[PDB]
Amino acid sequence: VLLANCADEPIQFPGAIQPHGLLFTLKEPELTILQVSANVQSVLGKVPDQLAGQTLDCVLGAGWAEVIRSTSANDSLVDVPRLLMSVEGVEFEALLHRSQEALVLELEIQDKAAQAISYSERTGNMGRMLRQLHAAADLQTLYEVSVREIQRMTGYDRVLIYRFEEEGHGQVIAEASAPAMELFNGLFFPASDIPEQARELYRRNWLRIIPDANYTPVPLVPQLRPDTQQQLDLSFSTLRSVSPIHCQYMKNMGVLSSMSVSLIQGGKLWGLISCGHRTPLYVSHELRSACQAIGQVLSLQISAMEALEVSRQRETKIQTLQQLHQMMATSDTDVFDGLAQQPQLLMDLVGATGVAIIEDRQTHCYGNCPEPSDIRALHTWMMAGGEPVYASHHLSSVYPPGEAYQTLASGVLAMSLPKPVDNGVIWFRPEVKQSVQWSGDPNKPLNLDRLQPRTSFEIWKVEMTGIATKWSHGDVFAANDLRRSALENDLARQVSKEQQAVRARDELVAVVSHDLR
Amino acid sequence: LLANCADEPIQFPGAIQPHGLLFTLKEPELTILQVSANVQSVLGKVPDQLAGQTLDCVLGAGWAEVIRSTSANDSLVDVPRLLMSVEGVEFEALLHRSQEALVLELEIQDKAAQAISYSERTGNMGRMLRQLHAAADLQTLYEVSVREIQRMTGYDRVLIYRFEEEGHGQVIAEASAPAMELFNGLFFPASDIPEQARELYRRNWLRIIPDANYTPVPLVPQLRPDTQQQLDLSFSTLRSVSPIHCQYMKNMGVLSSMSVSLIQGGKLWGLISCGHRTPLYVSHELRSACQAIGQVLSLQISAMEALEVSRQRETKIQTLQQLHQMMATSDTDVFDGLAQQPQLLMDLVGATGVAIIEDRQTHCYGNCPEPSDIRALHTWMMAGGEPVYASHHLSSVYPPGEAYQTLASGVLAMSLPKPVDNGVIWFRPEVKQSVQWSGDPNKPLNLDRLQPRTSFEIWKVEMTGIATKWSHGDVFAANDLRRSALENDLARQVSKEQQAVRARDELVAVVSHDLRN
Ligand SMILES: *C/C=C1/C(=C/c2[nH]c(/C=C3[NH+]=C(/C=C4\NC(=O)C(C=C)=C4C)C(C)=C\3CCC(=O)O)c(CCC(=O)O)c2C)NC(=O)[C@H]1C
Ligand SMILES: *C/C=C1/C(=C/c2[nH]c(/C=C3[NH+]=C(/C=C4\NC(=O)C(C=C)=C4C)C(C)=C\3CCC(=O)O)c(CCC(=O)O)c2C)NC(=O)[C@H]1C
């Protein structure tokens, strides 16, 4: 309840924009201003209250307004080129999109430092960087070169690859930090850092930048758009004010600038390319788009190399799978009995230290095996789910009665044939004591007060018990292939046995005729 | 005589193209082992006297020292740009190793090449990657890719030539200059790119031929004074091409070529071919950028192929599930219950004929061939041993399939892994397709030494006996139907066997009763 309040704020409708830019939501045909950020009282010296129901020619000039009108006319606003303007002597980069039948235009203010930065030198290493990405033979080298290039172009002190887990919390796997700067490599972070609302927003918007954490938000006047009397939806607006709790969180970490690129794999937020600077500094949108493209290439290569690793595991298990299939096919006994004829091969097929083969009230145990009654209770629990195969690296997390034998069997890989007879094969992996590193208190994710982010950011050890070694993709693949081979061989055996009985029946028909003479 | 097209030793031409200089040297002291004869015109050095001499004699002390530092203890896979001004003519240096020797190639940069800069032509690189990831169609992907490649290279014609299984390839993307012949959709004979060329290009992913009228400049000494063999210019961009290919390019009307190998899983998926009506040289930086574009193209092709396969999977999931529910609650034979609704089985794969074989009864629905012919086909199909089979041209692999090619030209067969003869076959009728070929398919070359064909006109070839291609979703549906049939059949045979061996034992008891009398 109170924890769930972390995921209830309407971040999509903040009503304010960051001071590093200007916002203009306008009517499409005549480019009449619907709302304008209050920052125009300082920038360009225009009163935002009178700038209602007025064309862009009043403030932005005739030529630039005509250029914007030409660009936005009969265009999907997905391939708009660069737009740099000098408006009363201050330069803006213009980005255009549409929220609800209205044209939202953001002018990112380019400072002198941004002007000094050029797109040529920082993207000079583009082709070689992609060559390095394709030439990397390890995931760690991939991460290293990616964060190295991203730090090279951005210039930020710390760059992190923060991969999300299923439950919401994430882990940092790549780190590139400046000297005399705190390291977060390998640290886990609570799921409360990025709420569900933030993940949902970032699944669509793949680029966020916060140049400063001490900024005072500049409200949008009029607050309600005079078209539907609602709040402007700044979901895809780079000029969106962030929640003050996040600003306090960044201040507590000690960083004053952030820049994150969403990594998307199959429409899901796989991770974030987080960045951190000890001092405020702004990054131009062109460099942000280049970093976004680097992130998309990174996601593509991650998927490619994950498939490559899965295929490598399949290849290294093909020989053992073939040997086991040949042993099962030419056993003339029950399928699981012939499988159990060679226990060591079955063990090394999955790399587990315990094997339990169940066949209709007989259980055979090899290696480190629990009490047979406990395994029977577990198996009768496992068939309730109905899944053909099951892999669990933490049985006690999902199976409450698994705490008694967590020292012997903390990882369970089970596969069963689709027949009424209770049969199956279970592989048990023992618990490994792992001291998971967390950034702060795992049992106190949030300082409950308005919510306040935790000040402490030190590394905490958590000796997580009852968790065994992760089952690899090749492991479950081998389990499924063994299940498929058992399915095929068992079907062959039953059809042949019926045929032999049928042939014996035909032989018996010959015998009955012989028994009649 | 046709096979002579794939016998020339292209890897050892003994000559280099005149647009550059080659230096193969011993690694430690950078002493020249052999040098191309082109040095008689460029830099004005006699190639005969340039034996057993350090690079300092011709290339200068500073440039020799930089090359020595770069090549020392380096894999030559991340070498930065190397531009030198040697007696007033500019060279770009590339370094690699063929056989325990350092091969260094100086590509000559003309004034036109010097004027061209890597910045402007690659300014839209990040936008190009954004367009690649944002494209929702394969045709859009190809279009934007060839558009960018034509933009940087400036060549008149750009083609995406995808290879087929048999060796011949087809052009799927075309970007041609005005008043220039179009090859969109045209098939090309496999003799255009022999097996040797494909094998060489599987390793070297970048080839450029600026001119077709060039006279090769021989390498002196021809044999290295280390192993008395020919230098292996496999990864050398300065390699002379076969004169037959030069004549082929002249016959096509192009005088410049530039190809990037597309690699998918270690296989030559296709080539990004290019064509210019006049000689023109492309700098190595733009070639490397095009290579990176090609690798990204291959990655996105694989990604979108997986996406299309998954879309087909989703659209067939409902039909597969409905058939599974109908099959599970039939209490009859598995294929009989499947055949209870023939139209649904037909629309599962989109075929016009269904043949279900169950123990000497064959049931035909829709456009079905002669039952004897289908039985012969089925007994031929089990010989291969594949669990599933898809063929879009049965007469190509089944000689007796020509009689019914009008009715069944596409066969999708799936059988259970049991000795008992059972199975499901889907038949697709022949569609008359006029395949377009560039020239004579039966006469690739005008045999007179092999000579490339002069004619490059579009030829219609009415290929009969070919049905519609079976999609990836089609074979996916076949395998899932096979899996569901496997599970249900195993359940049914296990149940019948449970209540079957009892009768056999009873018969034995009956026999025992009939024996004790
Ligand atoms: C219960 C509420 C909390 C809260 C909410 C919150 N946080 C964000 C934004 C972000 N938080 C991030 C977390 C990290 N930054 C890092 O550097 C690391 C690791 C080293 C982590 C785990 C990130 C990356 C974001 C996105 C913004 C960015 O930094 O680029 C939001 C979203 C706000 C918005 O988008 O307007 C919200 C609502 N965070 C907490 O920690 C608690 C107090
Ligand atoms: C029997 C011998 C033949 C011969 C041999 C041959 N051809 C090449 C090189 C290439 N041929 C290519 C074919 C095409 N170019 C196009 O523009 C199109 C389509 C519009 C096609 C099908 C290509 C792309 C190459 C690679 C070179 C390039 O253009 O970049 C070789 C290889 C030579 C070498 O690498 O040294 C050889 C041995 N070609 C024939 O047509 C017959 C006569």
3-state SS, B291-358, equals: HHHHHHHHHHHHHHHHHHHHHHHHHHHHHHHHHHHHHHCCCCCHHHHHHCCHHHHHHHHCCCEEEEEE
Residue with tokens 């014609």: B157
- What is the distance of C-alpha A466 from the center of its chain? 25
Q: Which atom of ligand 1 is nearest to the CA of A198?
A: 32
DSSP SS3 for B175: strand
Gap between the Cα atoms of A347 and A355, Å rounded = 7
Gap between the Cα atoms of B234 and B256, Å rounded = 20
Best residue for ligand 1 mutational test, from A206, A246, A437 (most atoms within 8 Å of Cβ): A246
A341 and A243 inside one domain: no
Cα dihedral value A357, A358, A362, A366, nearest 10: 20
A278 and A371 inside one domain: no
Gap between the Cα atoms of B123 and A342, Å rounded = 63
Gap between the Cα atoms of A77 and A72, Å rounded = 7
Sheet holding A423-429, edge to edge: A362-367, A354-359, A423-429, A411-415, A389-392
Residues of A in contact with B288 (CB under 8 A): 127-128, 131
A24 and A171 inside one domain: yes
Residue A500 lies in a domain: no
Q: Is residue B445 lining ligand 2, measured as CB closer than 6 Å?
A: yes
Q: Closest Cα to residue B344, out of B477, B492, B485?
A: B477
Gap between the Cα atoms of B247 and A26, Å rounded = 62
Cα dihedral value B343, B348, B349, B355, nearest 10: -50
B376 and B264 inside one domain: no
Backbone angles phi, psi at A163, to 5 degrees: -90, 135
Domain around B99: 3-304
Let me know if B20 is exposed, middle or buried by CB neighbors in 10 A (0-12, 13-18, 19+). Answer: buried
B255 and B337 inside one domain: no
Choose one of A291, A306, A321: the last residue of a domain. A306
Residue B443 CA, ligand 2 centroid: distance in Å: 16
Residue A267 lies in a domain: yes
Rounded alpha-carbon distances, angstroms, from residue A368 to A2, A320, A350, A410, A431? 44, 21, 14, 11, 12
Residue A503 lies in a domain: no
A94 and A36 inside one domain: yes
Q: Closest Cα to residue A11, out of A244, A269, A261, A255?
A: A244
A254–chain B nearest CA distance, Å: 32
Residue B77 CA, ligand 1 centroid: distance in Å: 39
Gap between the Cα atoms of B229 and B227, Å rounded = 5
Region class of A249: left (phi > 0), else alpha (psi between -120 and 50), else beta: alpha
Q: Do B303 and A303 touch (CB under 8 A)?
A: yes
Residue B438 lies in a domain: no
Backbone angles phi, psi at A358, to 5 degrees: -110, 125
Q: How many CA atoms lie within 13 A of A364 on its CB side?
A: 15
Gap between the Cα atoms of A471 and B428, Å rounded = 43
Rounded alpha-carbon distances, angstroms, from residue B152 to B122, B156, B300? 7, 11, 20
Residues of A in contact with B78 (CB under 8 A): 128, 131-132, 135
- What is the distance of C-alpha B182 from the center of its chain? 22
Question: CB–CB of A493/A474 below 8 Å?
Answer: no
Question: CB–CB of B238/B103 below 8 Å?
Answer: no
**Which residues make Cβ contacts (< 8 Å) with residue B21, sequence separation at least 6?**
B35, B36, B38, B39, B42, B43, B91, B105, B106, B108, B238
Question: CB–CB of A390/A382 below 8 Å?
Answer: yes
Q: State the Rg of chain B over Cα.
A: 31
B434 forms beta bridges with B462
DSSP SS3 for A17: strand
Q: How many CA atoms lie within 13 A of A37 on its CB side?
A: 28
Amino acid at B302: S
Residue A262 lies in a domain: yes
For chain B, what percentages of helix, strand and coil (3-state, to nearest 5) are there?
Answer: 40, 25, 35
Q: Do A120 and B125 touch (CB under 8 A)?
A: no
DSSP secondary structure string for all residues of B214-249: PPPEEEESSB-TTTSSB---SS-SS-PPPHHHHHHH
DSSP secondary structure string for all residues of A96-149: EEESSSEEEEEEEEP-HHHHH--HHHHTTTHHHHHHHHHH--SHHHHHHHHHHH
Q: Is residue B237 lining ligand 2, measured as CB closer than 6 Å?
A: no
Residues of B in contact with A494 (CB under 8 A): 490, 493-494, 497
Gap between the Cα atoms of A216 and A254, Å rounded = 18
DSSP SS3 for A337: helix
Residue B516 lies in a domain: no
Q: Is residue A60 lining ligand 1, measured as CB closer than 6 Å?
A: no
B292 and B221 inside one domain: yes
A24 forms beta bridges with A36, A105
Look up residue A503 and give its two tokens.
Answer: 């042939």
Look up residue A164 and give its two tokens.
Answer: 């999300």
Question: CB–CB of B174/B183 below 8 Å?
Answer: yes
Nearest-CB residue to B490 (from A120, A419, A508): A419
Gap between the Cα atoms of A178 and A275, Å rounded = 12
Residue with tokens 């315990």: A354
Q: State the Rg of chain A over Cα.
A: 31
Rounded alpha-carbon distances, angstroms, from residue A254 to A208, A278, A280, A321, A415? 19, 7, 11, 53, 50
- What is the distance of C-alpha B356 from the center of its chain? 36
**Which residues make Cβ contacts (< 8 Å) with residue A169, sequence separation at least 6?**
A188, A189, A190, A191
Number of domain units in chain A: 2
Residue B185 lies in a domain: yes
CB atoms within 10 A of CB A8: 9
Cα dihedral value B497, B503, B508, B510, nearest 10: 180
DSSP secondary structure string for all residues of B3-31: GGGG-S-TT--SEE-TTEEEEEE-TTT-B
Question: CB–CB of B185/B436 below 8 Å?
Answer: yes
Gap between the Cα atoms of B184 and B173, Å rounded = 6
Q: Closest Cα to residue B84, out of B98, B104, B100, B54?
A: B104
A21–chain B nearest CA distance, Å: 23
A229 and A103 inside one domain: yes
Gap between the Cα atoms of B444 and B452, Å rounded = 7
Residue A42 CA, ligand 1 centroid: distance in Å: 30
Residue with tokens 């020619």: A57
A145 and A250 inside one domain: yes
Helix axes B284-328, A285-329, angle to 10 degrees: 50
Residues of B in contact with A415 (CB under 8 A): none
Q: Do B489 and A488 touch (CB under 8 A)?
A: no
Look up residue B294 and give its two tokens.
Answer: 């090609």
Residues of A in contact with B419 (CB under 8 A): 492, 495-496, 499
Q: Taking CA atoms, what residue in A is nearest to B421? A: A495
B507–chain A nearest CA distance, Å: 8
CB atoms within 10 A of CB A202: 19
Identify the residue among B127, B147, B263, B517 best suited for mutation to test binding to A, counting A beta carbons within 10 A and taking the highest: B127
Q: Is residue A6 lining ligand 1, measured as CB closer than 6 Å?
A: yes
Residue with tokens 């979703």: B473
A173 and A249 inside one domain: yes
Backbone angles phi, psi at B158, to 5 degrees: -130, 130
Nearest CA to ligand 1 atom 16: A274
Q: Is residue A242 lining ligand 1, measured as CB closer than 6 Å?
A: yes
Sheet holding A33-37, edge to edge: A16-17, A218-221, A33-37, A21-27, A102-109, A90-98, A84-87
B347 and B475 inside one domain: yes
Residue B502 lies in a domain: no
Q: Do B493 and A496 touch (CB under 8 A)?
A: no
Nearest-CB residue to B126 (from A293, A303, A505): A293
Question: CB–CB of A249/A440 below 8 Å?
Answer: no
A48 and A100 inside one domain: yes
Nearest-CB residue to B490 (from A78, A81, A487): A487
Look up residue A36 and give its two tokens.
Answer: 């304008």
Identify the residue among B141, B490, B492, B495 best suited for mutation to test binding to A, counting A beta carbons within 10 A and taking the highest: B490
> 3-state SS string over A368-434?
CCCCHHHHHHHHHHHHHHCCCEEEECCHHHHCHHHHCCCCCCCEEEEECCCCCCCEEEEEEECECCE
The CATH number that applies at residue A409 is: 3.30.450.270
- Whether omega before B221 lies within 30 degrees of 0, making that bond cis, reads yes
The CATH number that applies at residue B282 is: 3.30.450.40
Residue with tokens 């009008």: B406
Nearest 5°: the CA angle B409, B410, B414 is 140
